[PDB]
Swiss-Prot record, chain B:
NADPH binds at T11, G12, S13, I14, G37, N117, E119, G196. Mn(2+) binds at D141, E143, E212. GO terms for biological process: isopentenyl diphosphate biosynthetic process, methylerythritol 4-phosphate pathway involved in terpenoid biosynthetic process; terpenoid biosynthetic process, mevalonate-independent. The gene is dxr. Pathway: Isoprenoid biosynthesis; isopentenyl diphosphate biosynthesis via DXP pathway; isopentenyl diphosphate from 1-deoxy-D-xylulose 5-phosphate: step 1/6. This is 1-deoxy-D-xylulose 5-phosphate reductoisomerase.
Length: 365, 379
């Protein structure tokens, strides 16, 4: 019994680390499909040559699946046990629903499909079929083996805090892309939107109310999240930052993969720091809670407004603090959007509306 | 689903705290028995009055002329209480030698054993393990309780390492030369007729960690070479397990014995509101440093004793008590405590055999003490 794995977004960081794990564990896994956004052409051909897999999709015109929904066609067609969806942003919602319709495990890295899809994605899924790839949700799943659902008091997500811990909003006005770790996932870390995306994700996957989902800043990124139980016990998960750990566990769930990552080393001194998030300077998480509480298409809106505002920062059209400022403005104008999505088109409509309202805000800021 | 609980050693700190948990949770727990040594009769008597529990035992032969009306009293009376009382959980918080036979009787009834008595595992470990079903024993101390919670994070073949944490004691960071002439008072030990000064000293010498390592091997069936100790001055994380994939799971809580007590009583179910949670609203730091094993050889020495097996950890602990008492009395220097344990272990080949009965554990302890007395007497 080898598990058959489709890797979507194979040429990115998650994708390539996923292939390394499969290659180290040929007894446990087998690659049977790949899909890539064509920008890293050279890597895909290398992966075809190395894995021998010809069953390949390319999202940008020997390839059996070329097009714009190339990855979606591949998923529907290929006999698989696990689909790893590491596609970035919006190009990943349709492949997620396709993946879930096949009945295969969805190892989800592309948290945007879930944040935007909301209930639409949940209705497609059976229990235990969506298995998170990010480190925080991997941690939580691990820690929740520490009890039953009614023993849970709080889920506690850790946030690196980005490069701007201690910065005031005034300090933030003069921030460039490279200081926020970008160039004209990493930006979302700097602005705390990633955490907001993760609060929503946490709610959708585990069923926990927003008011029992905390965020604490932990700059060493060694504790990946924690669970506090009703007795006052907290269970935490810890490891040096290395995506192959939660990638490995997502593919082999419920079984751990030996040697996937280096453990923490307690033979040299270290220090794990905690501090409260500055909610005045970084309100992305509170804003996510608002959108999640409103529900429906509002989380699609939260995310789409982000992608657009962030794109505007990365082109130099807006200042850094305006990214989360615009999400705020867009959300507060989105009273028509707390409706449950009936189809993909509804989600697609929410996103278009959010993009355009963001562009409008840009064209004033 | 009301669990019936027998609380042995009911008048010390663990017993008094267990009873408070039970009084706060009457729909989950029912006290059905109490026992305490005759030195603590008056307190035991108040507990009868307060709980309404008349099934009580004086666990030794003491206060004999005052135990008119008590249903069980005398040597091994706590054992008889345990044999004769229908219960779901026995909490054994008796101290020392007194704890062992009641542990064995508890396991024989089929009840869950919430175990606080160090003697049971350290000295009578093989007797105790032989008597138990898998999962029948649930530890009550912080560290082992942490470890039991953390092992929920995988199947047994996925466990790479268990990691006990340690405050490091008052002598954390001290060099060998600095510790040569420290006094009992500098270890933080001051005269009192209890195990308190001994407990404090064990924490300064790292013998306490040694014992916990032994206990870890017995409780969880993990080899001594996969049991680590790390220094963690804050004592917020109580222990961790590292799995074969590189993931570590840790348990963290402000120090409060009600937490592991509640868990040991209710296992596998948690008890709402037992203790305060960690608060992440104020900034904090959790630090780790390696144990200095050159200066603190007591931990590796406990592994040597554990690997030898049988009554060997009975020997380690009994030799400890003797040498430590001698340091307390000002008769030997601080480094000589672990030196004397090692000298006694080196002579103790005959005690590696598995004990057939409690009497063999007792013979091992008697041999160890006399051997340690001899060594003390010649410095
Ligand atoms: O699982 C992870 C993760 C954790 C530690 C380190 C890296 C992580 N993933 C990651 C980070 C950057 C880039 C990528 C990738 F390129 F997609 F692979 C993945 N996340 O979900 C990333 C959130 C966090 C994170 C942590 C550290 C850094 Cl350096 C970054 Cl950029 C993001 P946060 O929201 O700021 O806490």
């Amino acid at each position: 019994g080898r598990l058959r794995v489709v890797v979507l977004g194979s040429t990115g960081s998650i994708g390539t680390q996923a292939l390394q794990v499969i290659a180290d564990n040929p007894d446990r896994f087998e690659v049977v499909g790949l899909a890539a956004g064509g920008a890293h052409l050279d890597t895909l051909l290398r992966q075809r040559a190395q894995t021998g897999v010809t069953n390949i999709a390319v999202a940008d015109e020997d390839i059996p699946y070329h097009g714009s929904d190339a990855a979606t066609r591949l998923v529907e067609q290929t006999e698989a046990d696990v689909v790893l969806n590491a596609l970035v942003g919006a190009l990943g919602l349709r492949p997620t629903l396709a993946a879930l319709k096949t009945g295969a495990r969805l190892a989800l890295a592309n948290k945007e499909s879930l944040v935007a899809g909301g209930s639409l994605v949940l209705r497609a899924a059976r229990p235990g079929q969506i298995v998170p790839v990010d480190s925080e949700h991997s941690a939580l799943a691990q820690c929740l083996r520490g009890g039953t659902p009614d023993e849970v008091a709080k889920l506690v997500l850790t946030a690196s805090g980005g490069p701007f811990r201690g910065w005031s909003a005034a300090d933030l006005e003069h921030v460039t892309p490279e200081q926020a770790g970008a160039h004209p996932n990493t930006l979302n870390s700097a602005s705390l939107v990633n955490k907001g995306l993760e609060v929503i994700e946490t709610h959708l996957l585990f069923g926990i109310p927003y008011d029992r989902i905390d965020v604490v800043v932990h700059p060493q990124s060694i504790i990946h999240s924690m669970v506090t139980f009703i007795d006052g016990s907290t269970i935490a998960q810890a490891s040096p930052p290395d995506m192959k750990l939660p990638i490995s566990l997502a593919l082999g769930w419920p079984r751990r993969v030996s040697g996937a990552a280096a453990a923490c080393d307690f033979h040299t001194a270290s220090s794990w720091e905690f501090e409260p998030l500055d909610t005045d300077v970084f309100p992305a998480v509170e804003l996510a809670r608002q959108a999640g509480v409103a529900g429906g298409c509002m989380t699609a809106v939260y995310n789409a407004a982000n992608e657009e505002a962030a794109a505007a920062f990365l082109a130099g059209r807006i200042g850094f603090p305006a990214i989360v400022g615009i999400i705020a403005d867009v959300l507060h104008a989105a009273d028509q959007w707390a409706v449950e999505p009936a189809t993909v088109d509804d989600v697609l409509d929410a996103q278009r509306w959010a993009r355009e309202r963001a562009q409008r805000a840009v064209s004033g800021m």
